[PDB]
């Protein structure tokens, strides 16, 4: 389920790169998603070949990324047994953001729940709370594993990524500053291995890349 | 937003035929084909409609929706739906929530009807489903609160209904075709003979003992 | 098959927009987006036109226009009468160099590639003229009436061209003007009229019209 | 690059069934044709169709998607004509005027099919494919590269199922076939049992299965 994210000097989307969310001219991200693979979609291939962005998310409706207002979001993993409690997960979304609920995935819930929990002014705390809530519903109505999560998300100025699991397995996250691109890449699995090592983001951690550089912070579902 | 439904001796789907088609053939469930490409310009749909034969099918210019043995398509609207969509979704019984895959009012109607016992009481269950959505639109929506023409089936019987909270109701017509040897029900008249208009506040039932109309009100 | 083309200070594509768009931004070759899908409501198209900015693009409405090859793109409203009856002969006239670009089966794509075969890269006026005459003559011989109906917009990344010709009294319409608000030229299929039998040329020097007689 | 063909008492297409397509016979002398450019069992429509349509003769392959169909015939091909894009024009021009109208894409496989039709597939399936293959292989020798011809093909007219396996070198896409008592019909597969050896053609009809040497 490879994903990749970028924050730095603008590059062509392809130079990292189904679904892409990118920032360019607007505070809202452009969003492109279809059920065709990077290779079967000449439109996606043309966009990725022609559009440049200094902040974007890409990920191999129920396709990521998701976007609402200034924010976009993508997630690798699962909430265990989700289909057995989808209704209650849906019911937990605030009215304000419910209009953005367009498909039936757990990923989309996690995003809208994080918005409902204050993602706009408190991304760490809000994601932390949304995860606690969904993990609790999984423990109540679902199955193992209750929460497996690697996610990337942005407000169009800062790029975030978090990795967490209710057990010992967590979808992987790596990041590295590219001197050749002059910006940061964050990925589910390391690609370019000629230009320096990738730094693993450990489970239970949140990465923030913004005006100060890249910094990590402890991350666990809210008390 | 034209639709067409058929019940009688099997014909190729095209002999009647956003887009979709639900048809019964060899299984108690309907096959369901739907896509966002124009019917005119999707060659796969063309091949399906040119090659598949069926004695009970529904097609609609996404509808139809299908769950278990039932399928359902709907033309019209619930006024101001978007402003109370959460409340409508929360009214769906736990048992049918798994089938709610998009965000339309039409899909909620179908699943609310199933929740109200469509499987064993079609007339009553749709009546109750509509009164709930119209009620929610009165409270939280706008006018028109309910505009509805709908066709739906369990694979044995074809039903259609026409109802509206005001004076405009999306149209429904039906006709027995002697050349196909079956009934066609449509939203806009497709010669062989005239079409019969289903008036507002009526539900049509086509099964083993012909076609019959009866009063219908939420 | 209505179209619009733009040349001037970069705007969002949506500000002058089956379906397609060819646009130049950062490469000598154009971007090409095209699908068989009500423009009105393709969400991906909606994103692209809402977010991509360009100072030279063509938009229409493998068989969708525009077409692109190397630095050139091309778009056509009209028809070559009875084309289907002689498509083989028409494909045969495309030079070996350009046949690789022949991806679908329309008359429009054949015109573009025949024009490239006739030297569009160096002599846009004469090559399109020669390509139209060849296809019109094939229609006369093997096709049906109208033998040639054309309004076309096409570009090399620097210059925008449009032409209007017909073998009969009906020619798809072409109009143009300078948009002071956008600070660029708009050329459309539907203002100054570009009369039939004329080619228009828009570049760093302005707009100019000239006679065009396949 | 993977295909399956069936001939026998009708079954749901799924009881046999990136890029994808299926051609099936049911109620008409021409086949139905479904093909699309995304992964099978992702396309809910393909799912619906395979789960709901029954046929006693169909071809499925896992525009440029196979199968191809024209008149009563359908055809699919695993393999390649080496260097094809360098002489595509020359290949198209060898298609007879009568069949040119069916040339919709740019693949080598489509031209093989239409060249076989041009060479008399409707009356001589063995001879026509042999001649179509020799012409393309020689164009590859002349203008393309190696490998000049690799072919496993399945093709049908609605009544008979054919398969053929040939290569200009040591690698030929594989073909196996077997009678399935459960389904009561023949299954023929390429790159998933009796192996169809290279330089062989298989014919399955009302008389049974039979092989013959095939030497373009």
DSSP readout, chain C? --EEEEEEEEEEGGGG--EEEEE-SSSSSPEEEEESS-GGG-HHHHHHHHH-EEEEEEEE---SSPEEETTEEEEEEEE-TTGGGGHHHHHHTS-HHHHTT--S--HHHHHHHHHHHTTTTT-HHHHHHHHHHHHHHHHHHHS-S-S-EEEEEEE-SS-EEEEEEESSS-----EEEEETTTTEEEEE---EE--SSEEEEEETTEEEEEE---
Considering CB atoms only, which of D93, D103, D106 is closest to C92?
Answer: D93
Chain breaks in chain D following residues, C–N > 2.5 Å: 17, 62, 192
Helices (H), D84-207: 88-93, 97-100, 108-118, 125-143
User: Position of tokens 């993508």?
Assistant: A74
Would you call D122 helix, strand, or coil by DSSP?
A: coil
A32 touches chain C (CB under 8 A): yes
Q: How deeply is C141 buried, as exposed, middle or buried, from its count of CB atoms within 10 A (0-12, 13-18, 19+)?
A: exposed
Q: Nearest CA of chain C to the CA of D39: how many Å?
A: 19
- B10/D196 Cα distance (integer angstroms): 41
Query: Which experimental technique did the depositors report for determining this structure?
Result: X-ray
- D25/D32 Cα distance (integer angstroms): 6
Q: How far is CA D84 from the centre of its chain?
A: 18
- D10/D29 Cα distance (integer angstroms): 16
The domain ranges of chain D are 1-216
What are the chain B neighbours of A87 within 8 Å (beta carbons)? 90, 92, 94, 97
Q: Nearest CA of chain B to the CA of A9: how many Å?
A: 37
Q: In CATH, which superfamily holds the domain spanning D1-216? A: Aminohydrolase, N-terminal nucleophile (Ntn) domain (3.60.20.10)
DSSP assigned state of B135:
H
Return the CATH fold of B1-218.
3.60.20
A193: how many CB neighbours lie within 10 A of its CB?
9
Would you call A222 helix, strand, or coil by DSSP?
A: coil
Q: How far is CA A111 from the centre of its chain?
A: 9
- C105/C83 Cα distance (integer angstroms): 10
- Is the CATH number 3.60.20.10 carried by domain C1-214? yes
Query: Looking at chain A, which subunits does it touch, using at least 3 CB pairs closer than 8 Å as the criterion?
Result: B, C, D
C41 touches chain A (CB under 8 A): no
Residue of C nearest to A28 (CA): C51
Give which of C89, C93, C99 to mutate to test D binding, by max D Cβ within 10 Å. C99
Q: For the domain bounded by A1-223, which CATH number is listed?
A: 3.60.20.10
Look at the alpha carbons of B78, B82, B87, B90 in this order and tell me if their dihedral is positive or negative: positive
- B2/B151 Cα distance (integer angstroms): 12
C142: how many CB neighbours lie within 10 A of its CB?
16
Q: Nearest CA of chain A to the CA of B10: how many Å?
A: 34
Token code pair at residue A54: 């200094």
C93 touches chain D (CB under 8 A): no
């Amino acid at each position: 389920c490879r994903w990749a994210a970028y924050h730095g000097t603008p590059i062509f989307l392809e130079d990292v790169i189904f679904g892409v969310a990118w920032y360019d001219a607007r505070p809202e991200p452009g969003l492109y998603r279809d059920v065709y693979p990077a290779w079967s979609d000449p439109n996606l291939r043309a966009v990725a070949h022609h559009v440049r962005s200094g902040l974007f998310l890409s990920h191999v409706n129920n396709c990521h990324p998701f976007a609402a207002r200034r924010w976009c979001f993508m997630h690798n993993g699962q909430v265990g047994g989700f289909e057995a409690f989808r209704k209650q997960a849906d019911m937990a979304i605030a009215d304000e953001f419910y209009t953005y609920r367009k498909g039936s995935t757990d990923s989309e819930v996690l995003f809208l729940l994080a918005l409902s929990e204050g993602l706009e002014h408190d991304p760490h705390g809000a994601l932390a709370r949304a995860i606690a809530r969904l993990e609790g519903l999984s423990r109540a109505h679902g199955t193992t594993p209750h929460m497996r999560l690697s996610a990337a998300f942005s407000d169009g100025q800062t790029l975030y990524a978090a990795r967490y699991s209710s057990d010992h397995i967590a979808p992987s996250v790596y990041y590295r500053y590219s001197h050749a691109r002059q910006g940061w890449a964050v990925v589910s699995e390391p690609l370019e291995t000629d230009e320096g090592d990738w730094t693993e983001l450990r489970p239970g951690r949140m990465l923030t890349i913004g005006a100060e550089g890249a910094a990590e912070r402890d991350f666990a579902p809210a008390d």
